Amino acid sequence: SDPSSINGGIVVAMTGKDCVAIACDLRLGSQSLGVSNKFEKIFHYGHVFLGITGLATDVTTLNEMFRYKTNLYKLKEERAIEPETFTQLVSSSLYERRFGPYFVGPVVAGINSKSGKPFIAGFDLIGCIDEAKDFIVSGTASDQLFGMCESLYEPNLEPEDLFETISQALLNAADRDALSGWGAVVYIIKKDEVVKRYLKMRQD
């Protein structure tokens, strides 16, 4: 009965040269029982990508909530929300539930369409923004992801190289965690193209 580790899951984000990558596993379980191998944890609102780990009902709820808020934003502002602004919106929304929080570990990823700068950010369940040049990790195998990213990562990787680094970070972290795995998805994000790749990984 620890909300953040009932369903399981992981998300990792990385920056490269004029690009960003965000990746997640596909597992949704109920403790030991694996239930679904199609549960994607990465969503997007325009060009801003949001990955969410933790309690799956809140993952779904927050996605629906941020879709709601970004849609109204776009109607009133007459433009797509940027990653820096969306990051602030996530933080506000999470802290609003300070003493009854969503048990989640969100990760924002995207490229600012005006400046062209790659941007990633992480949060705790309660809204604290964790900005990073290099990488953000989240989920039940965050320790594993920290160890993989900290050793494997190097700055200014090309999109094709960055794909290999983030994929190897996720896969090997997932295989040391019982509640993570069962498939994986990687998003490579350039200024005006986004490639989505499903990884082959061990299914245990």
Partner: protein, 212 residues
């Protein structure tokens, strides 16, 4: 864990996974969960790693002492009862074991004994033990017949571990197969789930829940 062993026309199949866990941390993927007590005797391990590891190798020492003293290989019944009487002395102390003593002798024939840490000792044809026992039972029961061939029985044991390895989060790594005949036990290899799953999926057409 997921461990099984079943009796059939051609003897006994014994199959186990190879994962060790400490909470949600995957401690190992290459653990031996079958211990070869003697050429005609096997023991499966589920529960606390050391409790099984320590006391089943100790069991092997007691079986060796029996055949030195009695000039005859120990019966599966007597072997299992040494272990069950031992753990019963420790009942309440907190030992965690789910074991299966498998073997062939002349007087008994192929025999399987379930022995656990609360002192239960049961003779039987089919047992699945471990956190993923229910997943193994599902596949094993629905495909089991007494008249299975040695080839088909080996596969069913392998496929049942794979089923559990897939669904149970605390089972996986690789499958270790064993076949016990009148002549003794025969090892039928280590099978990594990493390759075995996709190989089984493709060839069998099963596991349609999974993104191919």
């Amino acid at each position: 864990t997921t461990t099984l062993a079943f009796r059939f026309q051609g003897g006994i199949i014994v199959a186990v996974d190879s994962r060790a866990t400490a909470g949600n941390w995957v401690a190992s993927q290459t653990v031996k969960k079958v211990i070869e007590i003697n050429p005609f005797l096997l023991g499966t391990m589920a529960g606390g790693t050391v409790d099984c590891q320590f006391w089943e190798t100790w069991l092997g020492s007691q079986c060796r002492l029996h055949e030195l003293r009695e000039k005859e290989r120990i019966s599966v019944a007597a072997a299992s009862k040494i272990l069950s009487n031992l753990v019963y002395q420790y009942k309440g102390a907190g030992l965690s074991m789910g074991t299966m003593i498998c073997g062939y002798t002349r007087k008994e024939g192929p025999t399987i004994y379930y022995v656990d840490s609360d002192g239960t000792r049961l003779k039987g044809d089919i047992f699945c033990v471990g956190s993923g026992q229910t997943f193994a039972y599902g596949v094993l029961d629905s495909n089991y017949k007494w008249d299975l061939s040695v080839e088909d029985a080996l596969y069913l044991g392998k496929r049942s571990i794979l089923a559990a390895a897939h669904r149970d989060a605390y089972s996986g790594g690789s499958v270790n197969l064993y076949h016990v005949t009148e002549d003794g036990w025969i090892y039928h290899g280590n099978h990594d789930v990493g390759e075995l799953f996709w190989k089984v999926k493709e060839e069998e057409g099963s596991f349609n829940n999974v993104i191919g």
